[PDB]
Nucleic acid binder design. Structure first.
Lengths: 106, 95, 82, 97, 80, 98, 109, 97
DNA sequence: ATCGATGTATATATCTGACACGTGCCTGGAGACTAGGGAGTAATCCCCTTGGCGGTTAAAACGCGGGGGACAGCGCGTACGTGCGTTTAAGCGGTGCTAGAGCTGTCTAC
DNA sequence: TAGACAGCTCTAGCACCGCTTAAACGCACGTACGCGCTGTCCCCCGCGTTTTAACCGCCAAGGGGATTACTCCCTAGTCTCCAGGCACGTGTCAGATATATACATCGAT
């Protein structure tokens, strides 16, 4: 009976794959046991946040399928993810629908 | 080999956990792997330099805890610290 | 030898990129100014991509070369590999 | 007949291209542009199409970032028409000029 | 407290003149105090995070250099 | 009548000396106090090396002098000489700091 | 046993090839490091150091000083366009800034 | 106790300075600044070569990876001269034992 | 105001291709035992950071004249926006091909 | 032992034709917006006076950062195995296209 590490961490992301990528990624000669659990938790939380806001944008766009336009809306609307992804280009995302107030008609 | 390494099933089941009524597009799906991959190398590289500066030879939860508190914004970093410690505690309690 | 495709970047394309950029009214030399800026950016990115191809001893520029060229300058682009 | 006022269909184009997703540059001239640029560094190159659309997306996003900074600096200059010196100032402030 | 106002208006003028500014409005001093404040908040937060990872009660110049080059601007001659 | 220079000559001349000079233009004790007051919000009973506060002061000074250069560039770009904080806001916005 | 001769002297370099190789190996850059990599990297570092030191010495001659100060280093970095592009995000400690006054601030007649 | 050894590039930078300027001295803060510059450029080029070896699934960093890192990070004339200097040093070290 | 054009939002039907699901597979993850050394803790030391006092002088702060520059108002013209006819080549589809990316095997320099 | 090399496959990039047509281009036309000009007036510079605290020096102390020594436990190392995870297959459904229709917004009147 082999039971996965992701369930023991209570997470969804693969703890074993994360530990493998750590050990072959050449970051240190040793890797602790709970560290890839923490990596999987952080990655899963970021994924959950961006997917939640993408689903919110899709429901605003009355869609039940996430497209990259919803992704650009979710990234550029939330301030924390926009600061984390300030140097980031999303292909086929477009821009935010922003118009400068001077350019509006009188 | 022809098989590829991707986080497709994991991001799709995270989507099903969050919104269990929403599909996902393939270009958006590759964008999900793009997200997961490069935040993996930024957080891992931050942990690498953090271990290098203190002359440590292992990556523990402390190094990435500092890395997440550094790179992530404040509420994202705080939430990630809290639930990462929760996941570590659940992993260690279940051994 | 391909020559003079800078005029293939036409006036409607530049005005569309201005409209998506939020520009309401456009002057005349803006077109060639953006063409020169496009020269600078494309030469830099394509030079980095060609160097990445050169280290791999390849003759085809892959999209992974393009994303690693964009990654070195910090203008990372999403949807073509991680 | 009916004629629209100067600026209102420019604002309509702003709205319609800000709500859009698709690429604003014709793909064949831009691909030819990439080939004539890349033929300088080495001769006889091949390009994957995914590389071509990646280069096009990066170019379009960098350009529209330049246009939004240019429009911000031109409205800062109490104008609505953008000058080339607005682009020069934006690139100088951004650190690339 | 008053320590942000310890960055005196003559000091702000001196630094603007180093920046090549000919004429300075009165609100520039408070705006630059705010900009210096938020920049110091970011850099000092990162440096204190580096210090707390090192289990130290003092902040070293090495942590300052690490935090600064995390921020994207790297300093020469003070470690690293 | 006492000799009084016109407005702008003294400004240009001390622009010239502080473009020649390299010393810090902030008094070190108030900036030390500001650094420790800011660091109080993150960790109590913090200590600081002198080199660390020196590095913070020189890095902050260089950052804000670059900001001042961009601010004056954007002010002159608006056909002006005096800088208002809208110039600083435009500089930080184009630089992606806002 | 033969005479101990350094790798840098064999490579015609002043930068320590063995120390660079040691820092590459414990720098966690790759599990294997080739023989030509530390020699090549030490040569590139020595070339860049030679260029900046020569330009800083030229600036010190321009300032009539025999000891190079950080002001000389800052002048040598900023006057050269390629070294300025290399060190664009680099701040130099108390090297100051370039003396530059833009033309519209100059007095008129 | 006795202080531990703290590595610096000070003597090599001084030797290069005497090579380029036999009469010009140097200050302590200046050698510290050049030491930091050497360490940061070493870090940049070595990290670029490490990423390059990771991109092309190679486990050995050789002169080719460092050369491509030079070609990428440095500007064109600086990279060209550094490629020339590193090439001659590698060839003359290969000629040596 | 106000109507009329006029594009957009909204609702319904046809379609399609893109993805949501299933299968097989295999290899990647997990389980079990091993060494060992790295990291943790305790003991040690000292330095350097902190704190204080003194003075003292340079700088900061303050007053104020004033000028000049910021800015509002106005004129103007022209350049850019808007519309129309033309045409150009971007685009799609199909066809041809082959350079070459990719993979496997060998082995020997490394 | 890995990577340099050879060799084989077969993928895909390039190249091409032709029709279509929407996109681009050329051009008319007027006006809104850039810009020049003027006046204003304020508010920032300049300089003297007053204030103050920044600075240096000098000392005291203690605490904590670095060091040393010891240990154990945590992580690599190795192996068997087996189930997670991953091309391929499949089909159906979400979205695109098309049409009618309501609805607000622009603009001439």
């Amino acid at each position: 009976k082999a039971k996965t590490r992701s369930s023991r961490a209570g997470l969804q992301f693969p703890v074993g794959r994360v530990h493998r990528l750590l050990r072959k990624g050449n970051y240190a000669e040793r890797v602790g046991a709970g560290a890839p659990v923490y990596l999987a938790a952080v990655l899963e939380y970021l994924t959950a946040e961006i997917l939640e806001l993408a689903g919110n944008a899709a429901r605003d766009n009355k869609k039940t399928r996430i497209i990259p336009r919803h992704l650009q809306l979710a990234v550029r609307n939330d301030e924390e993810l926009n600061k984390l992804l300030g140097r980031v280009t999303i292909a086929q995302g477009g821009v935010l629908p922003n118009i400068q107030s001077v350019l509006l008609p009188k | 080999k022809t098989r590829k390494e991707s986080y497709a099933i994991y991001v799709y089941k995270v989507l099903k956990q969050v919104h269990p009524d929403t599909g996902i597009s393939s270009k958006a799906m590759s964008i999900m792997n793009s997200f997961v991959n490069d935040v993996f190398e930024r957080i891992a590289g931050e942990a690498s330099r953090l271990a290098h500066y203190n002359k440590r030879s292992t990556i523990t939860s402390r190094e990435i805890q500092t890395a997440v508190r550094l790179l992530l914004p404040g509420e994202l970093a705080k939430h990630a610290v809290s639930e990462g410690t929760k996941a570590v505690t659940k992993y260690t309690s279940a051994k | 030898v391909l020559r003079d495709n800078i005029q293939g970047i036409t006036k409607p394309a530049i005005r569309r990129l201005a409209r998506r950029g939020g520009v309401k009214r456009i002057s005349g030399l803006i077109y060639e100014e953006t063409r020169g800026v496009l020269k600078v950016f494309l030469e830099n990115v394509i030079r980095d991509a060609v160097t990445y191809t050169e280290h791999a001893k390849r003759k085809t520029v892959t999209a992974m070369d393009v994303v690693y060229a964009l990654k070195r300058q910090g203008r990372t682009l999403y949807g073509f590999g991680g | 007949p009916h004629r629209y006022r100067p600026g209102t269909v420019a604002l309509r184009e702003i709205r319609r291209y800000q709500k859009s997703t698709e690429l604003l540059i014709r793909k064949l001239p831009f691909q030819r542009l990439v080939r004539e640029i890349a033929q300088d560094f080495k001769t006889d190159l091949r390009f994957q199409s995914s590389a071509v659309m990646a280069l096009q997306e990066a170019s379009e996003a960098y350009l529209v970032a330049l246009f939004e900074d240019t429009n911000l600096a031109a409205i800062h200059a109490k104008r609505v028409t953008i000058m080339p010196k607005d682009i020069q100032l934006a690139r100088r402030i951004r650190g690339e000029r």
